[model samples]
Target: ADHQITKRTDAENMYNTIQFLSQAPRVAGSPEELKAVRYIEQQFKSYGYHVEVQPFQFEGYTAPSEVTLKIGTEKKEGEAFTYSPNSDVTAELVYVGLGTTADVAGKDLNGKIALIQRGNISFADKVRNAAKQGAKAVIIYNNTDGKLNGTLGGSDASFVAAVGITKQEGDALAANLRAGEKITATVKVAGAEVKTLTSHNVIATKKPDANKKNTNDIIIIGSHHDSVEKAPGANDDASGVAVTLELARVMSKLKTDTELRFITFGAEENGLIGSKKYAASLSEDEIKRTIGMFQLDMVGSKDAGDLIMYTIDGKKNRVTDLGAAASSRLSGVLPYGQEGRSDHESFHALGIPAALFIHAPVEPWYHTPNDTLDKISKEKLDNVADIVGSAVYQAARPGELVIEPIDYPRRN
Candidate 1:
């Protein structure tokens, strides 16, 4: 096809942005995350768009600095589950079995620690029930023979601090408590910050000319700017964020019969909190005006698998159809699947034609400190950004002439 200029996108600039972003961890609700939010706003403003910063708050939890579980001088190391509030205690340990409401039916746990096994219920339920009986702290043991991972859904704080341990340590402690051995255990946890955190979403809008026919319609190109804890996320999402910014810069001066929005969401790793909030805040008219949402995530990992498209419900939508066509004509790869893993789910759930562009079998370093700039591949960034730009231009470009996007006429 002679219309190659339609796919024009700058990959080198994207790499530079990713390198700058991947230097530090961008955990949601932290100062690092807000830094990312400000940086996104600055970039969008530099593109000459009136950027909007939407702020929202949520209950946030910071991990413990030290979790020490000493069961009769054994000094065993453990981890605190999320949503555990700050606590320090030296109370006698009590074996509450499963920590069920029935288990603590008549137990006077005031000024005492509850040692419970993990089973049948969530970590939150067990801790809450124990705390109701005036327990000072809770220690949960694995039901199976491995490390235990748990979350409390960020509910019911100010009760007690909770830590997870292996079945071996828990069973032994429970045996001591059940036998009425009067063995004392001190559950001391410190440096856990639990509080409310306000985050922001950065949005940049480019409107169509006053004479354009499709002025009411719009397209979105976006990515989540926050990364998970401990990961620099050069590829997990910095890659996507950089790609989105590059698209915004390249298309800032281009022809547009349809409005375009470039956005970077926050708290994405926290269960798409930022995107879902933004989607929910949209009015009915705004929802109707949205034509497509293209979500870019993890698109430049050299160690990751092939680039693929994933829809919310395995159905073909405008974005997937356009992405498929662009890839078929430009990149020679196509295999989409049913996935609801990214911020795309937020838009697709609102009846929008949305698709997620990512590399499947994400690199092993995902969510790890190793996901740094050294692992990013510029070619991967270029390819995904190219397909995205082409698809959006194909829809946003005026239809009067099937001409190249880079060489379009100066029509106001």
Candidate 2:
């Protein structure tokens, strides 16, 4: 029965969790987020696993409960996007067409919000430029036809409260401003903090035999539990987290000879903060003991393309090789290899072998409010979970690492 837990059942549970996870928005450090963490903890306890909620503090930003724009007593419908931490202010609206530095060079933008178009550089760059011009707030509109949703690139260091609006609304505002209509926009974001906030990583272990000389060796399976604002993230990650939990539930019953740790990391959406903190906290000896790390992110979309694996440096590694071997032996598909940006990078940076398993050609709903449970694909979720489950088990139980050059130096 342990072997019978195929990808189909894995997908079923993944969809179920996705339904729950995506029910409401679960942004990091929110009450809803804490509830989600508690739910995951309960699931692990039900399987008789000793769970640990390793908490860490981070200085982070959060979106406002609501953002509004008004022109001459008319309230326009809009959504207030999140900005960096510790940002709070209100200002008069200034139409800085496209927000180019040259366009606003001589304009007095002090204590005002710049309404810019999304084009040329990145959104973060636009916001940075606006802040440099002394703009108190920013309102960026989609350059093309629809809603423009994106992140302020991870490495940027500017802090400005910004929001996004549809093209039609933006055009109307521009026209109203050109008509000499006085416009005032309000971007009220609560919970933006520079203080330390705590989040957790849930860990459960399956130990190997005590007599083995290589008892220190370990394999890790992981997923992220945090979701974006207004998105349930059913397919984005709850699918991955649920699959990890299910695998732990089934594999715990097996008598494996190598140590296995199943983990669900928090705050992954906030620039991989949770996993990075987890990796930083580990001792050098703990890092050396790790053999492989597998990250599962978004593996339950019906429209998902082929199975793809990604490494940190954009190169193939033992984790991918083992996963490919398992897929070839079971699903009859060639698993392609690629580079990724996910929690697995935390382990890879520590000199441990790591890879991420995700469905290639991600569906259209990625990172959107539309990423609901209805889009989950049981067939796809099960296939990925079963392959990863079997591969991890194979690596832990009485067998040598199947990838070549077993004598390669571990990360220092």
Candidate 3:
């Protein structure tokens, strides 16, 4: 019976789908992303499912046009962190190690700039800590060898103008200050903008056969279709989306007592914005009846480690148990751990039993421009599809009434 799904799982189809999607970076709210959404809609329709396109608004940030860092009379190379406000100021540089709350304790940075190292804390938090002490601006240097370029996540009132430079530049500044040299640096950022933008989530649903006994339960299988700004996002999520589409195709040919919903979210790189919107739009009955949510993310990179499952709370739940069982019966034991960066967090927040399936330790090309179709592994995609498809069938198969009485405890 499991062969019905396992045998139908086609890695080649998934590979070709990724090849098409990875042609360009699908940033949320962009035309490239819209094209991918429409393509997915057509695929679902061809699979005999009615698709719903859910749209939502989100705040978007545009990087600054110019960011300059000048020390004394000499100007050095620097780049502005995303969401940094435009400002021009010249102040004495004070090196605050890692910019932790305790590191900046009792320090008077009034009318001065704080030079912070990149480690142990987020770039946003470091800026906030320095800003709290009346620092006029911030300069963050990389901990490693490359140029420091990063995001402050989003715009905030507490975030002051900030920029990033290489480790060598920051180290020279920090060492001079330590050797009793007075350093006056000018930090100028300009042309940064923020605006309201719209993104979408595509959902395809399949209701149980009218002749069969309906279980009145819902199951959601989801993945994010949007990638980061520059990366092709072949493995980060295109792999997940391809697998989701393949599962929808396979499940459509089966007779199930449970309702199956296949979804692909947008603006996932900007945060879980799209999934959060869909989770909030659910009706009370729909929320209560949703038994499981399976999220697939970064599941087809050959360079990544073995397959793993992640739950928000890192505890055993019905979803993880089913996944583990399915994998054990097919391949081997599937290890689970605690993680919440994916779309599963949205469903979990609604007190639903949700788990994310992904290849652990991620790939080297994770968010880089090199994350293309060449890095995807067909074997990996087939394996994950087989396990997830079998697991979903195990729960949704007709005459399987054992799942109704067992309700997993809701996580707070």
Candidate 4:
């Protein structure tokens, strides 16, 4: 098998597509998310590859359009985090001290907004308990800590409009209310809805050995298509998705003995549900037939120090071995090794060889709105894509696979 036949220049187009899709907020289940999937599908189609959209539905919460807190006659801006449900109600501010379950007992919180310090339990749990006590809404204040950013644990119907405030702001409000001052606080959260929504995964395949007897053997390259609430996620995942798309475009034209599947998953932020469902649908034979799975999460951040690979069991495997070997072969630098956390975990659990490629020393703007295209590094993105592209092409050639699982001594 001539490995030199897999050479092609798709790095520039890959980086450009990554910059375009990751330039907006594409939260899961939103129209923007569907558009992102469509864009990836179009790119694959243009490359002369068959594409398929695997749609799945799940219950999700949309970010609040607006959130504000009013104390007395003055209006104060409040922070709105993801997964916050809607609520517009006014109630007397009752300082529940630390706001823990121990302090909330024996208090008449009916129709009142429970104001508690941020500590111990999570904000979602606190809001849930307060709502159970007949409280109309919940207000959590920082307990001498820095900014308190709240996050919902999982989906629940008992949630109320919850907001976190800085320690200074919370202390002042608590002081005013403690001085026998009647504080009427109103929290208005707009456009928060809980509904069932569908997201799609675009898949493309290239099989040089399509007519082979053992066609089940496959190599998968995947990345998530959705972004966070306001962040573009250019480097977070768009980088990975773009790289996978380009790999398919370049490799689809080449001749390989094994099958290759490229996929861009949706709703990865919602607990890797898309990959989980996809993996679960596969039969045991299909799972065993999978040769390797590579998950590209955030591969283009310049701030990220070095490249490392991870496995599902938090141990090194053949995928990492092959990646490091490939990096050393192409580039002089050796890629670091780590364990899996992203989409690769789905395949690893089923005994398929898989690993996640991530930039070590993660960027500071990760998971924040600052993860825009301006932060993306085209050079780094192209380097990773090229290296992985050549590596996959090398591994998928007709000869016996060079990367194999290692035999380790048993601890038990």
The full ranking of all candidates by TM-score, starting with the best, is 3, 1, 4, 2
Separately for all candidates shown, the number of backbone clashes (residues 3 or more apart, or on different chains) is 0, 3, 0, 5
Best by TM-score: 3
Q: Whose lDDT is greatest here? A: 3
**Which model is ahead, 3 or 4, in terms of lDDT?**
3
**lDDT-best of 1 and 3:** 3
TM-score of the candidate numbered 1? Answer: 0.79
Report the Cα RMSD per candidate.
Answer: 6.8, 5.9, 3.7, 4.9
Which residue pairs come into collision in candidate 4?
310-338, 310-339, 310-340, 311-339, 311-340
lDDT tens digits, residues 5-49, model 4?
225645678678877897687888899999998999999989888
What TM-score would candidate 2 get against the native?
A: 0.75
lDDT of each: 0.83, 0.75, 0.90, 0.77
In model 2, which regions exceed 4 Å deviation? 1-24, 59-62, 65-79, 84-122, 139-145, 151-158, 165-197, 213-215, 337-341, 368-370, 404-412
Residue pairs with colliding backbones in model 1 are none
Decide which is better by lDDT, 1 or 2: 1
Model 1 stretches astray by more than 4 angstroms: 1-7, 88-155, 166-186, 210-212, 312-316, 399-412
lDDT of 3: 0.90
